Structure 1
Amino acid sequence: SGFRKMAFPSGKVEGCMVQVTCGTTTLNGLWLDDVVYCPRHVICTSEDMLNPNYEDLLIRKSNHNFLVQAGNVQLRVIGHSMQNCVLKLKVDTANPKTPKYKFVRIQPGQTFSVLACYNGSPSGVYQCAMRPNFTIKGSFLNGSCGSVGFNIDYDCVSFCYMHHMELPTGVHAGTDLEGNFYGPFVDRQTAQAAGTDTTITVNVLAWLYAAVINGDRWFLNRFTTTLNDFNLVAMKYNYEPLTQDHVDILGPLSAQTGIAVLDMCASLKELLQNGMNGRTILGSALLEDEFTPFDVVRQCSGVTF
C-alpha cells in the first residue's frame, strides 16, 4: 500500500533529449527519427524576443547556424521549418533510441510527467497537471526551455507538452508538440499573467477515493447530495463544476469502495465548509488535485511499462 506523486519511468524520453544552440541561445530539443523539435524562440536574441518576426528571423538562417549535440556527438542539420511555435530541424541521422510515440493535446485537469533537462542532459522527473488556467506548477531554472511532458500507455510514449517560458508569478507555459500554446500565451517578452486558477474537483474526489482505499476514512459521513446542490458549493470555493461525465469516470472507484460520487461529494462539501479540523488525508493538510481517476486506479492496481 501507500500513495505517492508518481511519474512515468523516463527512460524512453531520456534517449531523445539533445542540446540545440543558435548563436548565443542554448536549450533542449527532442530527437525523434530524423527530426529535432524545440521552441522557435531559440532563433531570438534580446533584441528579437521584444517583438519577433519569426518567418523573417528564420529565413536568415544557415542550417549550419543550428548546433545539435546528442550527448558528446555532433548532429548535422540538413533542414529547418516551423509548425506554429515549434522549430523542426531535419538531421542526417535517425535516433536509434526512437521509441514508439505520438503527439497528443491534453485537457486541463489531465496529468503528465516532465523530464527537466539542462543542455540536453536530463536532470529530474516530476508529475504535473495542466491547470484550468493552462499553466503548470513546475520546477524550472534557466535553460530548461524545450523540456517535455509525456504519458506512457503500454510501450507508446504520448508527448503532450514542451516548456517555452516562465510567467512572472513562478508558474510555466508551453505548447503541444505541434507548437500550439496551452492557454492565452505568446512566445514574446511582453506583460503576460496567469488567469485566476481553480481546483480540479474530479481530481480531489479521485484523491479522497485513494485515501479511503489506503484506510484514511475519517471524512466519510452518512449523507448524499445532488450535482446542482454540490456545484453551488463548488462555484463558491473556486472549484471547477462537476459534470455527469466526471461522475461516470469515478464509477469504478465508487464500486470498489462503496462510496457513491455524490456520497463522497457530501464529504468534500463538509471539508470545504468546516475545514479538516487539524487532521490530514494521505499526510496532506491541503486537498490535492493533481491525481486523475486513472492515476488512482493505475497506482492502486499495479499497471507497468
Structure 2
Amino acid sequence: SGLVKMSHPSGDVEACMVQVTCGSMTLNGLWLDNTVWCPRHVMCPADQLSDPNYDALLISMTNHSFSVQKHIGAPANLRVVGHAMQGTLLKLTVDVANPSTPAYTFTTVKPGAAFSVLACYNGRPTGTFTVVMRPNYTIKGSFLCGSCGSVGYTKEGSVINFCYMHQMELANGTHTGSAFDGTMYGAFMDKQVHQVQLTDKYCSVNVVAWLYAAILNGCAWFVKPNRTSVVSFNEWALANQFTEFVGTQSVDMLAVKTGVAIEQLLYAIQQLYTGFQGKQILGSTMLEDEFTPEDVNMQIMGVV
C-alpha cells in the first residue's frame, strides 16, 4: 500500500540523451535511430532571444553548424549529415544509429494525463520526476537554465512513448515544451515575450481517483450516501475552477472494487473544495489532482 509520486525507471531514456551545440547555445537532444531531436532555439544567438526569425536562422545553417556529443557511457561525437526543422524542433540526422534505441512511439498527452520527465543539463541526466499536463496546457516542473531538450515520456510495457521536449518557463514553477510533431503544448511561442496563460483548474477525474485511493488505504470519512450526477457536477465544475469529469474504465474499476459510486465522490468534492475544516485525507488538507486513475490502479491494486 501507499500512494506516492512515482516515475518510470529512466535508464532506457538516459541512453538516448545527448548534448547539442550550435553557435553560442548548448542544450540537450534525444538520439533515436539516426535522428537527434532538439529545440530549434539552439539556433538563436544567445542575445537575440526575443522575437527570433527561425526561418532565416535555419537557412543560415549548414550541417557544420551543429555538434552532437554523447557523454553517457563512453564519449562519442556524432557526425551531423542532415538538418531539418519541424515546428519548434530540429531534426538532426547523424551518421550512426543509436545502438540502444528502445522500442518507441510518439504521442501527444492531454490535460490530466501524467508522464515522467528526465531532466538533463549539458547532455547529462540529473533528475527525474512526474508531472500532469495541466488544464491550461502547462506543467508544474522543476527546470533551470540548461534544461531545454529534457524529455517526458510514458510507457506501454517496454515501449516508450515520447510526449514532451522541454522548451520554456512561463512563470514561477510553470513550464511548457513540444510534442514531437514540433507543436508547443498550449501553443506558446518559443520566444521571450509576455504570454498569458489560462487559469489552472483542478483535474476532477484525478481528484476522484485519489479519493478512491484514500478509501482503499483506510481513509473514507468523506463518503456519504449523498450523490451528485456527472452532468450536474460538470455544470458546477465550470463555475468553480474544476475540469469537467469524464469517466473511464480505469475509474470504473475503482468504483467496483470499493463499492462507492463516482457520484458519491462528486458530491464530496463539492463539500470539500472550500477546505476540509481540520481533517486530512492521506496526509493532505486540500484536494490532490496529480494521481490518475491508472496510477492508483497500478500502485494500490497492482493492475496495468
Residue 225 of structure 1: how far off its partner (Å): 2.2
- 1:52-90: CA deviations, max 9, x gaps? 221221111121221111112211111100111110111
Give TM-score scaled by structure 1 length: 0.94
Contact 2:25 2:46 in 1 (8 A): no
Residue 231 of structure 1: how far off its partner (Å): 2.5
Residue 267 of structure 1: how far off its partner (Å): 1.7
Contact 1:247 1:261 in 2 (8 A): no
Matched, 1:263 2:277: no
Residue 193 of structure 1: how far off its partner (Å): 2.6
Contact 1:2 1:214 in 2 (8 A): yes
Residue of structure 1 equivalent to 2:132: 129
Residue 47 of structure 1: how far off its partner (Å): 4.6
Residue 242 of structure 1: how far off its partner (Å): 1.8
2-side partners of 1:248 and 1:28: how far apart? 38
Residue of structure 1 equivalent to 2:108: 105
Equivalence map 1:14-163=2 (5 Å): 14-71=14-71, 72-163=75-166
Identify unmatched segments of 5+ residues in structure 2. none
SS of the aligned residue for 1:136 comes to coil
Query: How many residues end up aligned between the 2 structures?
Result: 301
Contact 1:237 1:272 in 2 (8 A): no
2-side partners of 1:142 and 1:46: how far apart? 12
2-side partners of 1:144 and 1:202: how far apart? 31
2-side partners of 1:235 and 1:59: how far apart? 46
Matched, 1:217 2:223: no
Matched, 1:179 2:185: no
SS of the aligned residue for 2:301 comes to coil
SS of the aligned residue for 1:48 comes to coil
Residue 171 of structure 1: how far off its partner (Å): 0.5
Residue 247 of structure 1: how far off its partner (Å): 5.8
Residue of structure 2 equivalent to 1:285: 285
Residue 303 of structure 1: how far off its partner (Å): 5.4
SS of the aligned residue for 1:149 comes to strand
2-side partners of 1:229 and 1:168: how far apart? 34
Contact 2:35 2:91 in 1 (8 A): yes
Residue 283 of structure 1: how far off its partner (Å): 1.4
Contact 2:273 2:286 in 1 (8 A): no
Residue 176 of structure 1: how far off its partner (Å): 0.3
Moved over 3 A (4+): none
Question: Structure 2: which amino acid aligns with 1:146?
Answer: G
Residue 256 of structure 1: how far off its partner (Å): 0.4
Residue of structure 1 equivalent to 2:253: 252
2-side partners of 1:236 and 1:214: how far apart? 31
Residue 249 of structure 1: how far off its partner (Å): 4.5
- 1:206-237: CA deviations, max 9, x gaps? 01001111111111112122223323432332
Contact 2:7 2:129 in 1 (8 A): yes
1-side partners of 2:238 and 2:58: how far apart? 46
2-side partners of 1:253 and 1:195: how far apart? 31
Contact 2:114 2:292 in 1 (8 A): yes
Identify unmatched segments of 5+ residues in structure 1. none
Residues 102, 160 of structure 1: CA spacing in aligned structure 2 closer, same or farther, 3 A cutoff? same
2-side partners of 1:103 and 1:247: how far apart? 23
SS of the aligned residue for 2:298 comes to helix
Of all paired residues, the percent bearing the same amino acid is 51
What RMSD over aligned residues (CA atoms) do the two structures have, in Å? 1.5
1-side partners of 2:4 and 2:189: how far apart? 34
Contact 2:2 2:299 in 1 (8 A): no
